[PDB]
Design a binder for this molecule. Structure first.
Ligand code: 2EI
Length: 277
């Protein structure tokens, strides 16, 4: 039967070669993972969390990783898999290196060359990965375009899921029930998915630009939402609006979003209007 792949790594066994970026949970480095007793040198990304932690707190992280990072059994092509973890005065997470970066930077850098087929396919892929997370009862809590990574321009993967349940704030991506009462469910992830789609359709525009984070809940209560992106027909915008209903049970399911976006992906020029398709 299918085994649980996550590995506990020694401080040796992997090396950090260059800083890649970040300033949110920690610092990401590109490096090599040399599994002891083997002859492979695997290129990996290493996230070293900024908080300190203790040997007792590290055991709680280990207990959470055993419940969490293990019950992602078959794997999904659109979900990043945690290859290893090393807890020793710092918390370090090891995944396969993705040289092409995040989808947020990609859509900003290629604004003038992105077609409707690519945009709709990324929506399909993100929903497939999120549906897989829902099947394994894992709430992401931080779905955003910065947390979607580019394997190839035709293949994206979700990363950084459950990085809050591991031990113990993106207001403009959060559902109203998350802002007000810190309630997080697969349906609050659907809201964040809708904001992520908006990010892609606006080529990486900042949601609610120039509006303070303290004002978002009162704007959502008033009924205001993110505007219809220029390339979006009413069809795609309606899906986004459904993701942002106050009633979490009235929002789409990731399983329904796979079907809607896959239908739109079959005839993309009908749903997105881009100068150059
Ligand atoms: C462009 C956006 C940006 O600046 N960032 C995105 C974010 N980031 C990027 C990477 C990464 C870069 C290159 N190659 C791969 C990944 C990561 C990242 C690095 C190392 C580990 C890591 O783990 C995420 C994760 C995966 C799976 C699980 C968890 C966490 C928790 N559980 C339970 C899992 O199963 C991600 N991060 C920051 C910056 C660089």
């Amino acid at each position: 039967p299918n085994q649980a792949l996550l590995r506990i790594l020694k401080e040796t066994e992997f090396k950090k070669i260059k800083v890649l970026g970040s300033g949110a949970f920690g610092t990401v480095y590109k490096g090599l993972w040399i599994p002891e007793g083997e002859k492979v040198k695997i290129p990996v990304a290493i996230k070293e969390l900024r908080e300190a932690t203790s040997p007792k707190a590290n055991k709680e992280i280990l207990d959470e990783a055993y419940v969490m990072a293990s019950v992602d059994n078959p794997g999904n092509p659109h979900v990043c898999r945690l290859l290893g973890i090393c807890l020793t005065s710092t918390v370090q997470l090891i995944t396969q290196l993705m040289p092409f970066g995040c989808l947020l930077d990609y859509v900003r850098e290629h604004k003038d060359n992105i077609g409707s087929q690519y945009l709709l396919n990324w929506c399909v892929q993100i929903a497939k990965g999120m549906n897989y997370l829902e099947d394994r009862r894992l709430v992401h809590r931080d779905l955003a375009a910065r947390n979607v990574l580019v394997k190839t321009p035709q293949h994206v993967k979700i990363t950084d899921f459950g990085l809050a349940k591991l031990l113990g704030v993106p207001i403009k991506w959060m559902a109203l029930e998350s802002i007000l009462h810190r309630i997080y469910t697969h349906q609050s992830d659907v809201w964040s998915y809708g904001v992520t789609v908006w990010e892609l359709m606006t080529f990486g525009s900042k949601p609610y630009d120039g509006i303070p984070a303290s004002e978002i809940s009162s704007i959502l209560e008033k009924g205001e939402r993110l505007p219809q992106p220029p390339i979006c027909t009413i069809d795609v915008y309606m899906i986004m609006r459904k993701c942002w209903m106050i009633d979490a049970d009235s929002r789409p399911k990731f399983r329904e979003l796979i079907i809607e976006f896959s239908k739109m992906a079959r005839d993309p020029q009908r749903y997105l209007v881009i100068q150059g398709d």
